[PDB]
Every structure is written in C-alpha cells, then in structure tokens.
Short mmCIF file of C-alpha atoms in Angstrom, two decimals:
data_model
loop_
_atom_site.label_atom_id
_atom_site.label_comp_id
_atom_site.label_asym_id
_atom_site.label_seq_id
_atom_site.Cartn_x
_atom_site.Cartn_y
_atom_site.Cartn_z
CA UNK A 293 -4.77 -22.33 21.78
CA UNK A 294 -3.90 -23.75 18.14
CA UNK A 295 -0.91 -22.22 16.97
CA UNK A 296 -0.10 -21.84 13.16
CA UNK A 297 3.41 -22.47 11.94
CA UNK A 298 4.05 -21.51 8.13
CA UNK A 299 7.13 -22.53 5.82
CA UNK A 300 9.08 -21.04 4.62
CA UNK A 301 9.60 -17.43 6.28
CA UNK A 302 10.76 -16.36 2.78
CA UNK A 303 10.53 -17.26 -0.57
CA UNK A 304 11.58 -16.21 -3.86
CA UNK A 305 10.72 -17.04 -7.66
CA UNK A 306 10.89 -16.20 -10.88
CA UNK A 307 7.87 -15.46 -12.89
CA UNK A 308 5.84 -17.83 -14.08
CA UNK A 309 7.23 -21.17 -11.15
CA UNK A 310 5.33 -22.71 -9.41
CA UNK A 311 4.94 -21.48 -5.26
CA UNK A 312 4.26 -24.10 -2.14
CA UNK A 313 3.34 -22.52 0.67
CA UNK A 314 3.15 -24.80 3.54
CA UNK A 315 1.27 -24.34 6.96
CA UNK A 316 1.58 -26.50 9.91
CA UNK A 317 -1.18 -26.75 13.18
CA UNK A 318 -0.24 -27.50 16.66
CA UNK A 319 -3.57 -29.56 16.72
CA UNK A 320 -6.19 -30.76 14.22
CA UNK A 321 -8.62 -28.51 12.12
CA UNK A 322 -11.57 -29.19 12.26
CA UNK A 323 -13.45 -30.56 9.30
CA UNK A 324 -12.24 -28.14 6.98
CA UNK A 325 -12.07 -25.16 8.30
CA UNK A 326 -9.12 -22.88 6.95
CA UNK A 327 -8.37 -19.63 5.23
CA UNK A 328 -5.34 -18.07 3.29
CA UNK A 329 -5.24 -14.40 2.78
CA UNK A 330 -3.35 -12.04 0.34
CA UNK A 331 -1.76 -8.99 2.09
CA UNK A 332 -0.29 -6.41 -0.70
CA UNK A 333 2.11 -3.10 0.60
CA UNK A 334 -0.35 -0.15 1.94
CA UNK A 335 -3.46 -2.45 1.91
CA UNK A 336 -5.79 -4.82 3.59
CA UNK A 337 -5.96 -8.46 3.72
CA UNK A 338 -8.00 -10.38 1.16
CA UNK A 339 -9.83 -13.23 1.48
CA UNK A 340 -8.20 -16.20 -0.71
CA UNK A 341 -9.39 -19.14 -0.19
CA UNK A 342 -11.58 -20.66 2.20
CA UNK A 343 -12.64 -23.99 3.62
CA UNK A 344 -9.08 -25.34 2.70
CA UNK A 345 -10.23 -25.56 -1.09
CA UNK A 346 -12.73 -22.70 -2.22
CA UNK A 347 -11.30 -20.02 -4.53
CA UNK A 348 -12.82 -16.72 -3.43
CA UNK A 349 -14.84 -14.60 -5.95
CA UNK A 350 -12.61 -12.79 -7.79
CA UNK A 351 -9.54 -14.63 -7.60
CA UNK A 352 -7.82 -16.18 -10.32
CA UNK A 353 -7.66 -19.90 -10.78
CA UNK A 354 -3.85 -20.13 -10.73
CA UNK A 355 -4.39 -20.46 -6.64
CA UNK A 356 -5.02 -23.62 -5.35
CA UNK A 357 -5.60 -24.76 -1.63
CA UNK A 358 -5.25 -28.56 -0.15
CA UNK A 359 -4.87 -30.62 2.77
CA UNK A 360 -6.29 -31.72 6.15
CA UNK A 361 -5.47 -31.91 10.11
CA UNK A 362 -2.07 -31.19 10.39
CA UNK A 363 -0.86 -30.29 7.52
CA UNK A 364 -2.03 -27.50 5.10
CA UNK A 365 -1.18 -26.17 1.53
CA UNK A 366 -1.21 -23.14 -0.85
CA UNK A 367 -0.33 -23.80 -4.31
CA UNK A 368 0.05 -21.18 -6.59
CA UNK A 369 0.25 -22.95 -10.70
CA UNK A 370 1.92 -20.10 -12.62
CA UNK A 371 3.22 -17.38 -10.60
CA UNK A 372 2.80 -13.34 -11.63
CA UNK A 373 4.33 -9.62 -10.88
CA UNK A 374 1.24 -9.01 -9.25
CA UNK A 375 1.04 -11.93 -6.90
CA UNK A 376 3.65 -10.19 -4.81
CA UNK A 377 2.57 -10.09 -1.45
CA UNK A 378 2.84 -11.50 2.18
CA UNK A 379 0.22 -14.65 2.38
CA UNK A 380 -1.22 -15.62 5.67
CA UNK A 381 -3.04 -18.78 6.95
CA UNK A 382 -6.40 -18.83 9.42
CA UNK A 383 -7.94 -21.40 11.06
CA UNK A 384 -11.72 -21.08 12.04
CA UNK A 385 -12.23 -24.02 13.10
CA UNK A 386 -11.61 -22.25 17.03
CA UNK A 387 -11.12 -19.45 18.28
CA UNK A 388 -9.07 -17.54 14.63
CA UNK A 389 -5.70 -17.68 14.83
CA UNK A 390 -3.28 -16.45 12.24
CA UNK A 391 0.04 -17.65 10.63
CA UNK A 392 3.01 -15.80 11.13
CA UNK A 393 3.00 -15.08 7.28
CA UNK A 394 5.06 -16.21 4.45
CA UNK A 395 6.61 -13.23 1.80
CA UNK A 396 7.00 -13.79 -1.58
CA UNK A 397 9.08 -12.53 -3.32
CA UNK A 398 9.55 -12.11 -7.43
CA UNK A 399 12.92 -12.18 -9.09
CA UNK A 400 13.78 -10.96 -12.53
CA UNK A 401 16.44 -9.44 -14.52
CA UNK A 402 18.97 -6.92 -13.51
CA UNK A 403 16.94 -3.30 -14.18
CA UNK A 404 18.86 0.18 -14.01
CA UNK A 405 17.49 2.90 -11.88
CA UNK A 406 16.16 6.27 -13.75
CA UNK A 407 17.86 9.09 -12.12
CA UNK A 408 15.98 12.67 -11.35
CA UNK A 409 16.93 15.16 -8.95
CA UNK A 410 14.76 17.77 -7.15
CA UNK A 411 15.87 21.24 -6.24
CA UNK A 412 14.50 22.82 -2.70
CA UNK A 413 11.31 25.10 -3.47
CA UNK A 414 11.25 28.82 -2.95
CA UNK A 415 8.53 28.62 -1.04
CA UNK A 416 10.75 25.69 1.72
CA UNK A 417 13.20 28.23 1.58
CA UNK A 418 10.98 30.72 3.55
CA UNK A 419 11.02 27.78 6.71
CA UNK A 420 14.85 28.10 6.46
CA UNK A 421 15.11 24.65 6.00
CA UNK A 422 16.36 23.26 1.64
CA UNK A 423 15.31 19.28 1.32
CA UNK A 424 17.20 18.10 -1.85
CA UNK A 425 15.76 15.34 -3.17
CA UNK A 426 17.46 12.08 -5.47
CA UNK A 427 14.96 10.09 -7.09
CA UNK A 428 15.91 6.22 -8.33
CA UNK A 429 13.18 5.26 -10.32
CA UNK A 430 12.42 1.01 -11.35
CA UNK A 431 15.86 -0.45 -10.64
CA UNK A 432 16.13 -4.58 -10.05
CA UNK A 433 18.27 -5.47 -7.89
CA UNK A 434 17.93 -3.09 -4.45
CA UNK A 435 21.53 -2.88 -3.63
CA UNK A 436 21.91 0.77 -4.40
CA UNK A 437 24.14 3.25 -3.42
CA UNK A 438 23.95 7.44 -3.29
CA UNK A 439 26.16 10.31 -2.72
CA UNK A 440 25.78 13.45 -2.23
CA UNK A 441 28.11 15.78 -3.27
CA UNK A 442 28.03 19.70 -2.38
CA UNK A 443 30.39 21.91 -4.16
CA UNK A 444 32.44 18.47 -4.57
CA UNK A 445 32.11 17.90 -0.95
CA UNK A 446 30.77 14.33 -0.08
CA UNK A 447 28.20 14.69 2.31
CA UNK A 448 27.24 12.76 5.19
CA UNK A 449 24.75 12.48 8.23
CA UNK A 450 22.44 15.08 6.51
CA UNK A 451 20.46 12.36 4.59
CA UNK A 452 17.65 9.30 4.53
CA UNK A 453 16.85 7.48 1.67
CA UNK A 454 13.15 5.59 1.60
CA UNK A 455 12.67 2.74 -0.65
CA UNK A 456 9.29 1.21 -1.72
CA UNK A 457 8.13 -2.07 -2.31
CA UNK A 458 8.61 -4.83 -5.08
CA UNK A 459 6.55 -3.03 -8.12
CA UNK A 460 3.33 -4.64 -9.01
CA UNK A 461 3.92 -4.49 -12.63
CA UNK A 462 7.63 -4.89 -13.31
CA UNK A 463 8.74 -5.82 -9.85
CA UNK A 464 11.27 -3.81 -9.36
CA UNK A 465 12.12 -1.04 -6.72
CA UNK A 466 12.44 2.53 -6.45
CA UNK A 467 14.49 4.57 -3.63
CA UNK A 468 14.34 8.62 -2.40
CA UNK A 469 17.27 10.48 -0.69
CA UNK A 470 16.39 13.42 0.63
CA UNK A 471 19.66 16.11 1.69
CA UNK A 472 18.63 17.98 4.59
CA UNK A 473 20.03 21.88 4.67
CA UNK A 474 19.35 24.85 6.39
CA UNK A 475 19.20 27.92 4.60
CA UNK A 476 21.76 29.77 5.16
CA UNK A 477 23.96 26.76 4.17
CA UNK A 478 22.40 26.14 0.94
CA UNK A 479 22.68 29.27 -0.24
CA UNK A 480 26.30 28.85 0.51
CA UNK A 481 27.18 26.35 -2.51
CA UNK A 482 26.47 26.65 -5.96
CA UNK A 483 26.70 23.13 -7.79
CA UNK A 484 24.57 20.05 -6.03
CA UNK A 485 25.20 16.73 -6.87
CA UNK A 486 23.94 13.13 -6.97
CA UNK A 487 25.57 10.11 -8.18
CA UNK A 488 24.17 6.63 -7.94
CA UNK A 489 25.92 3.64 -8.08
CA UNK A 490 24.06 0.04 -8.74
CA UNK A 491 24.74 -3.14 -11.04
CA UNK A 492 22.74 -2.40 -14.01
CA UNK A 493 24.99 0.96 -14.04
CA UNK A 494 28.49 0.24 -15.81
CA UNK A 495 29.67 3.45 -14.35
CA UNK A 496 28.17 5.55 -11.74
CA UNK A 497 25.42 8.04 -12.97
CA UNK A 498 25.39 11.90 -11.38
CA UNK A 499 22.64 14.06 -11.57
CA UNK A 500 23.05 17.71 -10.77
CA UNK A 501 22.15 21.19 -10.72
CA UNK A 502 23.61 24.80 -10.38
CA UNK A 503 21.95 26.99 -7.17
CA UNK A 504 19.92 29.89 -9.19
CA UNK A 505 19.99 28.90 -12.21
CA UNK B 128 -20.77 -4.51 0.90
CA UNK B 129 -18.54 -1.38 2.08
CA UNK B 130 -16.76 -0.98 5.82
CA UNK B 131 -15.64 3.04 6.82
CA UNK B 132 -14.07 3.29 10.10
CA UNK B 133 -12.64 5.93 12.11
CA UNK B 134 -10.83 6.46 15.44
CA UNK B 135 -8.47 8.71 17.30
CA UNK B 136 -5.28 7.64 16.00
CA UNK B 137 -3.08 8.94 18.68
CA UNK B 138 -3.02 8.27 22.32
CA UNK B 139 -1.26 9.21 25.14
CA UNK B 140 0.06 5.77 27.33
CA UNK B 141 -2.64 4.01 29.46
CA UNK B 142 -5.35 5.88 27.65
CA UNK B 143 -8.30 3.57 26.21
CA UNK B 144 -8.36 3.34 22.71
CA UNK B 145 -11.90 3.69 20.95
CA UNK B 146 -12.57 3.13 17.25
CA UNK B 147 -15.41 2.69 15.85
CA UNK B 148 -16.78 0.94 12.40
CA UNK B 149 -19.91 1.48 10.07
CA UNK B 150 -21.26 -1.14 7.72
CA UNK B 151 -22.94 0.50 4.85
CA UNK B 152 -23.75 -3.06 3.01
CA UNK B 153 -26.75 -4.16 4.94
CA UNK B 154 -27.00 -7.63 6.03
CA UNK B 155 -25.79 -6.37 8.81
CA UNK B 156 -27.74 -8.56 11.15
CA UNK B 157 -26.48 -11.82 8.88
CA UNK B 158 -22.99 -12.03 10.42
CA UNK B 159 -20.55 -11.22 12.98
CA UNK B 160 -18.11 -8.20 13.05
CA UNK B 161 -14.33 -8.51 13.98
CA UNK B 162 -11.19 -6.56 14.58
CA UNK B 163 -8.50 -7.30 13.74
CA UNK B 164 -4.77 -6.08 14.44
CA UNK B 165 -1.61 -5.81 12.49
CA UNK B 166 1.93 -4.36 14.56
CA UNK B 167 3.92 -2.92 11.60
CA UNK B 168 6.11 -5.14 10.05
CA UNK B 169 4.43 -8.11 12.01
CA UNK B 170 1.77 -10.80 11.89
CA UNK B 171 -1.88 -10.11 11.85
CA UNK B 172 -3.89 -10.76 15.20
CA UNK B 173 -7.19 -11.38 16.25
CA UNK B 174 -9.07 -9.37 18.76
CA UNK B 175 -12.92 -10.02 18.91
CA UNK B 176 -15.80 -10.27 17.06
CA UNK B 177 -19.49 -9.43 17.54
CA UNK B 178 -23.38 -9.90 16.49
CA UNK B 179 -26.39 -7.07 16.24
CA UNK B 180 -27.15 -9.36 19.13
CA UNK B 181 -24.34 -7.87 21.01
CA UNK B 182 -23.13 -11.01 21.92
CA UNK B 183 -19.44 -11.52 21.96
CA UNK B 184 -16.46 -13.27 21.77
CA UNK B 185 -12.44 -12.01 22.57
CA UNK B 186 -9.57 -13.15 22.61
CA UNK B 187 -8.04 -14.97 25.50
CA UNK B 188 -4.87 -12.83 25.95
CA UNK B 189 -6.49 -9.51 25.57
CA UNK B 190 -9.03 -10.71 27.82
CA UNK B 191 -9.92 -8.17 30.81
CA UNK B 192 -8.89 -5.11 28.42
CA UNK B 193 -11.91 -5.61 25.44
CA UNK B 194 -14.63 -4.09 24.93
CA UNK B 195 -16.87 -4.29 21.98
CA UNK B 196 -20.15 -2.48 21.47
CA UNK B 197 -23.13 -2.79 18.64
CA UNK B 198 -25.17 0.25 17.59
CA UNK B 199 -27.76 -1.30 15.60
CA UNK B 200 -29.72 2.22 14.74
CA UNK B 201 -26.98 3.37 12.86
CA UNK B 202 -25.66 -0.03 11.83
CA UNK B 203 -22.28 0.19 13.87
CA UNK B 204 -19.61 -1.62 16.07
CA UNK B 205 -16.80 -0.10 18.00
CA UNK B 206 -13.92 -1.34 19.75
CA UNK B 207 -12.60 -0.53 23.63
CA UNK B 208 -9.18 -1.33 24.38
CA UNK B 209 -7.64 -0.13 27.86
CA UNK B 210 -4.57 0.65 28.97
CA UNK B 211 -2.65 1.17 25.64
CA UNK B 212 1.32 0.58 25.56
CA UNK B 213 3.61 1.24 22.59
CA UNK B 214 3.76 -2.62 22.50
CA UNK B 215 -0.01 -1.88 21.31
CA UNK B 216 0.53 0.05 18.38
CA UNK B 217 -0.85 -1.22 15.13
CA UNK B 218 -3.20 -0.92 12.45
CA UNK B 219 -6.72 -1.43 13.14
CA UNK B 220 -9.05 -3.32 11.19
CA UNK B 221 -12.82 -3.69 10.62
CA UNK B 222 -14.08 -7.23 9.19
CA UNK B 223 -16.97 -9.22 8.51
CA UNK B 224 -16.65 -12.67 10.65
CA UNK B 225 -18.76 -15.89 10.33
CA UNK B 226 -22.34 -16.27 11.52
CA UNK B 227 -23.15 -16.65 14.50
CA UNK B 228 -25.67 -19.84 15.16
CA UNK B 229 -28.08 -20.53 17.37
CA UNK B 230 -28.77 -24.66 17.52
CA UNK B 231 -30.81 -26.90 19.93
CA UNK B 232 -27.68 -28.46 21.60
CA UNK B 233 -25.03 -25.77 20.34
CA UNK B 234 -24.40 -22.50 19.77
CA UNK B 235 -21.20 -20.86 18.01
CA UNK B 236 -19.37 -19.11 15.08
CA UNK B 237 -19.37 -20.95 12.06
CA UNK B 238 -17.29 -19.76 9.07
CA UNK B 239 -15.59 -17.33 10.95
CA UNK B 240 -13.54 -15.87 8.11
CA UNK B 241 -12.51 -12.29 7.62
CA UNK B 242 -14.32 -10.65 3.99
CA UNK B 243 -14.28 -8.18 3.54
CA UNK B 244 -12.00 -5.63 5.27
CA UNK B 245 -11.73 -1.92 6.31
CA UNK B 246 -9.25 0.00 4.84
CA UNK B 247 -7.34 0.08 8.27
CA UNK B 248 -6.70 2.55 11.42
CA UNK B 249 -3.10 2.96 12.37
CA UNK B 250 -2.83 3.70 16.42
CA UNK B 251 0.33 5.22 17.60
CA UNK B 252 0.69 5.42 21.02
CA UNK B 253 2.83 8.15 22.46
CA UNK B 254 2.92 11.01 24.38
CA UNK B 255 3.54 13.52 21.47
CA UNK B 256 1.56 15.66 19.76
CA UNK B 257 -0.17 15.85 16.76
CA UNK B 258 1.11 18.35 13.97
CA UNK B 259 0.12 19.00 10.47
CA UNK B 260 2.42 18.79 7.80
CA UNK B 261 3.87 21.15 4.94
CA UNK B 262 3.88 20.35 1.38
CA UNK B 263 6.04 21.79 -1.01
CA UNK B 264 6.40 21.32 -4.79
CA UNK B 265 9.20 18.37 -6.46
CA UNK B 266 9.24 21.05 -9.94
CA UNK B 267 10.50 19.59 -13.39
CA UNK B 268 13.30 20.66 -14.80
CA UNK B 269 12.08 21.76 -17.82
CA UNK B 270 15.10 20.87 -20.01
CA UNK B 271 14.66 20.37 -23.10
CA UNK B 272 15.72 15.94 -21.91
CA UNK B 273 16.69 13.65 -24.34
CA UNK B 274 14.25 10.99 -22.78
CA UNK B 275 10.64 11.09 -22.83
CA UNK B 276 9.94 10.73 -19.38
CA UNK B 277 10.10 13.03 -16.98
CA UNK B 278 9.67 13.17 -13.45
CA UNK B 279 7.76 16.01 -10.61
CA UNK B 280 6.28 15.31 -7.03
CA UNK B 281 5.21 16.05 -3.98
CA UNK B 282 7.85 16.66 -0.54
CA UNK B 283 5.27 16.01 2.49
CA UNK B 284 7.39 17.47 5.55
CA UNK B 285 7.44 17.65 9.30
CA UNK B 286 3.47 15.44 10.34
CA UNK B 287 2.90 13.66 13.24
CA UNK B 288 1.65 11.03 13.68
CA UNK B 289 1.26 9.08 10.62
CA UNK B 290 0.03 8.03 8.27
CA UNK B 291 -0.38 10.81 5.40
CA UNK B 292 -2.33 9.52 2.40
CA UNK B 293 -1.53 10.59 -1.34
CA UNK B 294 -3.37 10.65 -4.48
CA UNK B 295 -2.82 12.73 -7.69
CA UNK B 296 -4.92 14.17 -9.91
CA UNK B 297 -8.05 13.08 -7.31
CA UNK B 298 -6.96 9.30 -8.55
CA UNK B 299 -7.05 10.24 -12.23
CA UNK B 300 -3.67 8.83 -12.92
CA UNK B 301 -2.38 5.78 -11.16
CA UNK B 302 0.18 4.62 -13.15
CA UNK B 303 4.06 5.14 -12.53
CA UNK B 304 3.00 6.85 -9.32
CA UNK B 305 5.41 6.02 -6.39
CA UNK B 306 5.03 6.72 -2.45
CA UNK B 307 7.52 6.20 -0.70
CA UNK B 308 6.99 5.20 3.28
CA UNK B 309 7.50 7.93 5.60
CA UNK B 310 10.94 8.32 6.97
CA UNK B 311 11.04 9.13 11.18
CA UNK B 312 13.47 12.40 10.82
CA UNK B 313 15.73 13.49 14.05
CA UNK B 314 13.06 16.05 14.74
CA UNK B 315 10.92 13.43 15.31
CA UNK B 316 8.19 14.04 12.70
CA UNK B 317 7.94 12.15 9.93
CA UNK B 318 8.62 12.99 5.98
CA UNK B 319 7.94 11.41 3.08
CA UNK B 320 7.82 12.26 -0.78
CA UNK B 321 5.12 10.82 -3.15
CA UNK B 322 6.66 10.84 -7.36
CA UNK B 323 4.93 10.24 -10.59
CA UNK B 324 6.62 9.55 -13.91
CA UNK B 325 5.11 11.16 -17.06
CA UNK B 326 6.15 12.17 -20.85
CA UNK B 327 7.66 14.96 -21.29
CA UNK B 328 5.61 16.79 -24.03
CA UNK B 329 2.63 16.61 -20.90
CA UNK B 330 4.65 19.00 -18.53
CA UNK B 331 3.66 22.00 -20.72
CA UNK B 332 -0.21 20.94 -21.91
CA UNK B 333 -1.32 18.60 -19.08
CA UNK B 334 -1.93 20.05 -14.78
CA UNK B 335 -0.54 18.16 -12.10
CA UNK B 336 -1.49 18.54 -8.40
CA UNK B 337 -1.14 15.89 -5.51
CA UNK B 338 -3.70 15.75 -2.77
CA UNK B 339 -2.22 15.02 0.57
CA UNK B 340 -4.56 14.24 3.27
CA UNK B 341 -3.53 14.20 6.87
CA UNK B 342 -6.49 12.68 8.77
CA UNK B 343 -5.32 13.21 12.42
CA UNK B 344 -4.90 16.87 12.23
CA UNK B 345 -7.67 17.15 9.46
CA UNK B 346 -5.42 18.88 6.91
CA UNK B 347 -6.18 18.43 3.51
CA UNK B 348 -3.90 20.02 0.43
CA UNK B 349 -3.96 20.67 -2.86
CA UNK B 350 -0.78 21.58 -4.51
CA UNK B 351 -0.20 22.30 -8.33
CA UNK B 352 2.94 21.27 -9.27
CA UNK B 353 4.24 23.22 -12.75
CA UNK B 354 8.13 23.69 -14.01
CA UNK B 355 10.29 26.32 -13.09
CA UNK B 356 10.86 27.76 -16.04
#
C-alpha cells in the first residue's frame, strides 16, 4: 500500500564527500518508523539505522538518518572504500515495504590491471575439454578489453569474461576470461596468448605461454 | 543471535517451494520471524512474518500462495510458497521482525525491522537437473617473476544450479582473494573461477588449497593447488 521511491538510482563519489540519499513515501510514516539497510556484493542486508535516526550497534558514526512524513534522508559525513554498497529504505510503520535501492558507487584514480594467465590442467585435459584462463587483477576504470590470440590467430566466440565488484579496499575491479577448447584443438597450437588493453596501460600488455613447456 | 537455514534450492515449475529456518539465539519467543526475498539484480521484497504464537501476517500480493509454519520444540519457522514460476526465483532470506503486541484496544507489529539476517537461499526454478561440478587446479608459473606477487586459483566447471561457495585455506587467508560470479556457459551449466594473489617466495614454503562447496548436490572439494614445475 505505501510505496517507497528513492533518489537517485545511481550515485557516484569520491572518497571522503559527502552522500545524500533521498527517499520519498506515497503516504505518511508513521511516527517514526523507518529503516535503511546496507547490502554489500555476495551478502545479506544489514540493519543501519532505525527509527529514522538510531545508528545501529556497530555502525560507524559517519551515517546519519533524518526526516519525517514524506520525505526521508540518509546522510553519510565522510564517505569510505568500504561503504560501497546498494542502500535500501523500509518503512514499518505498515505492512514493510522496501525502496527500490540506491548504488553507490566510489571513484578514484585510474589503476592498471595485473596480468596472469592460466594454462589448462592435465588432469581437464582427460574431460577433453582445455579452459584457458586471463586473469586482470585491481584495475580502475572497468573499460577493459581482451584478446585471445592462438598461434597468432585472434579468437572469437570461444570466450566469457566475469568481472567482480567495486573492491572493498581499493575499489577497483578485477575481470576473468576464460578460452574454451576441446582437446584435440589445443593440442593443435603451440604458443597461447593474451593481451589486454585498458587506460592505465600505455600500450597493450600480452601474457603468454608455449603448449608443453 | 545466529539464523541457519536450508531448503531445496531447485524446483521444477508449479512445485511448492519449502525452506525452512532455525534460530539458535534464543529469545526466540521475544519477536517475530520474516522472509524476505531478493530477484537477482533487483529490489528486496517482503513476504511474511511470524510469532512462536503462530500467528501471522503476509503480504497482500502473495496472498493465497503463503504459508508459514512455527516449530517451537526445535525453535524453527519455515516458509510454503506454491506454484513457483521463474518470475519467482530469488534469494531467500531468514530475519528477525518486530514484536508482536498484544494491547487492550490493539494488537500489532511494532518495530518491525529486519536484524539480523540469514545468510540467504538462492531458489532457481527450472526444469533441469542438478549436477555437481569439477574443479581443476589455476597452477603458478613458477618463473623465476620479476614482481613479488604471484597469482594461482581455482577453475570450478560445469554445476548446476548455483550457487557454489569458495573459501581458501578453510578461511585462513582472506585477503587479495577474488571470486568471480558464475558465468551461464552454452552448455547450460554454470562456471566460475575463484583467484588469490600472494608473494612469490610463498609458492615454494607455504600450501594452498581452495574448498569449493556445492550445497545442492552435496559435493564438497578440497584441491591443493602447487606449481608445475
């Protein structure tokens, strides 16, 4: 029945700003009775703040909550690397409802990824399947690019790349490509290849290895 | 205060799903008990909540296909939801809710917000079936590097459904770990590969093994991960 609007969809800061995290009802809270939660990757809500105001035990005193009937609040003083997340608003005040959310995001300098790449194990190679995989390890920004190259061959439709989430520590990213042969094919080719291609890179990097050796 | 929950995990279409939570805390006749639902990628959302009383409250649009139940001998609460779709895929999620009061001229929830949490039950709803997955070795290269780091993991291949939990060391070293989310190959099981950063000098004097767990087909693996030499 009361719907919660939050603003903005998106947000993102540098280190140490100030956030304002807005949250709008389609019809009065009652006395004071609202919640903001924390949501990190891979984990469970946390309890902020509650009753519009209350810090939570455990939670650090840059978080602030205000406001009343309409129009509700967050405030957080001095932002940090680790207060990336995806904050939600709750009334309780009926039957809980929930905000559509509001992700924060941190900005920083331009980082350059670390480059590592995995040959297929002997024991894979029994399936008859080789998974060669390109590790890009704690690069800011996340436009990134990767090529595979066989035996100088550029290859593609035979890979995925996964990337994870804004670090908790440094905020940056880090992506996986994973080259998907069959055995008889990989066996094939001697020299595998992978070259990488971001901003903190003045020239592409390449990463390789020799089949057997 | 500690929630553990467990639940099937995979379901065919229009099958009932049934999870179920256990409080070991105590207090657990002091306040209500909710779950709570998160679509991947979406918005959290409300379901129900309920007292050792065994009364209960839902919520208005999944009204007609709840079910929540108390067993107050062994101190838990489960959930009933019929008819599953693919539109009902999410994460499940145990909670502790507000009190429930009992007044002279009123009776309701008061307080009624969520702390703490379970760690979460994803529900994939298909028609598929389940498979265990292989893990296979990410092996140094054992060259002689001209940076101190270096880098070995684990290649978690062909599960379903997910999700596939990863630890190293049995949690004895967190840092510069990395996991990536799984990746849904054309085979249609998923994949994923789980990395870890360390000096160099440690590859030779210091054992690394990853422990993936795969809950839904109740594999569990331990693989030591050494260069090729």
């Amino acid at each position: 029945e009361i719907v919660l609007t939050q603003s903005p969809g998106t947000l993102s800061l540098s280190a140490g700003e100030r956030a304002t995290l807005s949250c709008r009802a389609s019809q009065s809270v009652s006395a004071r009775n609202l919640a903001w939660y924390q949501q990190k990757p891979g984990q469970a809500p946390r309890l902020l703040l509650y009753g519009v105001s209350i810090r939570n035990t455990g939670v650090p005193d840059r978080f602030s909550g205000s406001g009343s009937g309409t129009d509700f609040t967050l405030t957080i003083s001095r932002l940090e690397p680790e207060d990336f997340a995806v904050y939600y608003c709750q009334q309780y005040g009926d039957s809980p409802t929930f905000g559509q959310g509001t992700k924060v995001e941190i900005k920083r300098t331009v980082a350059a990824p670390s480059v590592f790449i995995f040959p297929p194990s002997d024991e894979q190679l029994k399936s008859g399947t080789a998974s060669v995989v390109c590790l890009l390890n704690n690069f800011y920004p996340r436009e990134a690019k990767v090529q595979w190259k066989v035996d100088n061959a550029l290859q593609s439709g035979n890979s995925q790349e996964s990337v994870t989430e804004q670090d908790s520590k440094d905020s940056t990213y880090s992506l996986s490509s994973t080259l998907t042969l069959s055995k008889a094919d990989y066996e094939k080719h001697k020299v595998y290849a992978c070259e990488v291609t971001h901003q903190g890179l003045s020239s592409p990097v390449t990463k390789s290895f020799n089949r057997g050796e | 205060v500690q929630l553990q929950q467990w639940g099937a995990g995979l379901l065919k279409p229009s099958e009932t799903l049934s999870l179920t939570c256990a409080v070991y805390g105590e207090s657990f006749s002091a306040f209500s008990w909710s779950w709570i639902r998160q679509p991947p990628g979406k918005g959290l959302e409300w379901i129900g909540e309920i007292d050792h009383t065994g009364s209960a409250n839902y919520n208005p649009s999944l009204k007609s296909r709840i079910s929540m139940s108390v067993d107050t001998s062994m101190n838990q609460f489960s959930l009933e939801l019929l008819s599953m779709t693919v539109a009902d895929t999410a994460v499940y999620y145990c909670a502790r809710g507000g009190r429930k009061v009992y007044h002279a001229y009123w009776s309701g929830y008061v307080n009624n917000c969520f702390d703490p949490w379970g760690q979460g039950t994803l529900v994939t709803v298909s028609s598929a079936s389940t498979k265990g997955p292989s893990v296979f070795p990410l092996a140094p290269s054992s060259k002689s590097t001209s940076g101190g780091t270096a880098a070995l993991g684990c290649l978690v291949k062909d599960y379903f459904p997910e999700p596939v939990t990863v630890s190293w060391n049995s949690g004895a070293l967190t840092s510069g770990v990395h996991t990536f989310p799984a990746v849904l190959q054309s085979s249609g099981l998923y994949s994923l590969s789980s990395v870890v950063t360390v000096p160099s000098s440690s590859l030779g004097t210091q054992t690394y093994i990853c422990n993936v767990n795969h809950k839904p087909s109740n594999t569990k693996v331990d693989k030591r991960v050494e260069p090729k030499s």
